[PDB]
């Protein structure tokens, strides 16, 4: 799939991710989505379109939309992950379970990315789901700088 990432259609990507999610292949699913996002836009037309305020009537929107379809599918993966392992312990008899390792392996792939539009989309997503747990614990300024632009705009963001 990764070899033909740039050519994958939203219908084929969705079905693939769903099938991988059903087989507990969370990390893998996420890695495909990121790869597809980066291949449908190697010039980062999306990053500049967001850095320019998203001017309507511009034709980078398409490039941004094709990445947003990948990012949404990543949300579903992480969602289904916490769902599948709801009630499962992170440790058994001392060492980590298999359900725990898949959580770490998945979230690794996430924090191991250099896609910037992606990390913006994830900050917004964490805020949405209410995970002040993880967002306030990033450390990075990148998230501060991102908030500094969106603060005078929304109460919830300003509070963060």
């Amino acid at each position: 799939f990764e070899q033909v990432a740039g050519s994958l259609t939203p219908a084929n990507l969705t079905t693939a991710v769903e099938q991988m999610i059903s087989l507990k292949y969370y990390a893998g699913a996420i890695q495909l989505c990121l790869t597809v996002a980066q291949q449908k836009d190697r010039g980062n037309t999306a990053l500049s379109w967001v850095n320019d305020g998203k001017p309507a009537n511009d034709s980078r929107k398409k490039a941004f939309d094709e990445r947003k379809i990948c990012y949404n599918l990543i949300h579903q993966v992480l969602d289904k992950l916490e769902s599948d392992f709801a009630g499962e312990p992170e440790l058994v008899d001392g060492r980590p379970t298999l359900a725990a390792t898949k959580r770490m392996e998945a979230y690794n792939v996430v924090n191991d990315s250099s896609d910037e539009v992606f990390h913006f989309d994830m900050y917004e997503w964490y805020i949405e789901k209410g995970w002040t747990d993880r967002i306030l614990s990033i450390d990075s300024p990148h998230v501060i700088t991102y908030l500094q632009r969106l603060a005078e705009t929304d109460f919830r963001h300003a509070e963060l």
Partner: peptide, 11 residues
Amino acid sequence: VALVLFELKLL
């Protein structure tokens, strides 16, 4: 009890 520790990134 191993699975719990595994789905909690503690094992």
